[PDB]
Design a protein around this ligand. Sequence first.
Ligand SMILES: CC(=O)N[C@H]1[C@H]([C@H](O)[C@H](O)CO)OC(C(=O)O)=C[C@@H]1O
Length: 380
Amino acid sequence: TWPAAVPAPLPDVRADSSTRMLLGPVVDLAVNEHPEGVFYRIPALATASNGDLLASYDLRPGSAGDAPNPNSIVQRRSRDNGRTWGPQTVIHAGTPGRRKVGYSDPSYLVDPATGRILNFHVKSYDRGFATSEVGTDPDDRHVLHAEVSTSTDNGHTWTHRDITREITSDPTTRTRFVASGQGIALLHGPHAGRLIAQMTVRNSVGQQAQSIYSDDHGITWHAGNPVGRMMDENKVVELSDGTLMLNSRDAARSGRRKVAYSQDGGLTWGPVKLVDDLIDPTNNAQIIRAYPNARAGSAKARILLFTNARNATERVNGTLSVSCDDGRTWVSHQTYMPGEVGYTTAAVQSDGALGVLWERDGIRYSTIPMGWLNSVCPLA
Ligand SMILES: CC(=O)N[C@H]1[C@H]([C@H](O)[C@H](O)CO)OC(C(=O)O)=C[C@@H]1O
């Protein structure tokens, strides 16, 4: 039986001997048709409190179908910053058939204050995101449910529970999913300690972005006020002063990401605008702090990293973009993976390099050493 996780700070980026951004070796974490008729999609990557690197993704049986295909959440672990990977383990396995159950679209949320790791994902019965109906009864086969899996042992074992009712304060909310990739723990400002992740919802107003957050270190979850129209998978990041930012996929296909700001820890958001700098084909993406422990007023606290498919209509050219100024401008875009990438995510690793995952005939992993960062955002 594995030991209890202990509290430990999230990693910050560290300087390498590199002077240019160069992808390391590519690792095939899961390959479609290995085994026959099984497909892999929807990546999540995190550094656990013990420094292990954890990758999660869907196992999709039969085809790469979204919910309500009876998918499973699975995981692989590296204890050497991505050089080698243990065998796949199951976070929560779906069930085929007339009473099918599916677990799909994982995101991790690591709480450095406790060491606990959360993995959010849908729980489906007969309906997916688009066809789910109003209702929150846990056995309702017409509802797309929200589950969170908790691990207290750095991701070796999991316990599961349905959070749909507690995050549904508006009874017209007919569907929801937490965006795959990773949520955050807040470290700065009045809401330090809060754990927060973003969802997409449909309700009487439209298709909105909505934060869910916990102030008791993941025992109970509450939804903030929803925001925006034609929103979709969106990710939240804590800026240098503790203002939050959400960066969203645009369901209206503008060819750009969308952005909004919260001054109250995700309870309310302001107006949603396009980010003209961030070309995107209506696809998932991940934004993170490079130095999440750095304090307000430091240059390091203002540096954000963003991964997506930098293209207006096709999910190609996995690209790392850097902002030095709390997301106000994006001064550097560099494609680390030409061609098909689908969903990407990135996470700071324990060694201070960046891990990336993308989708091409399954899930692929690589590393970007980060010594070149100071040449784009001076660090002093
Ligand atoms: C829960 C769920 O359906 N997630 C799916 C998501 C969603 O349907 C869309 O973001 C809504 O607009 O889309 C995609 C996609 O490749 O585009 C795959 C995700 O599995």
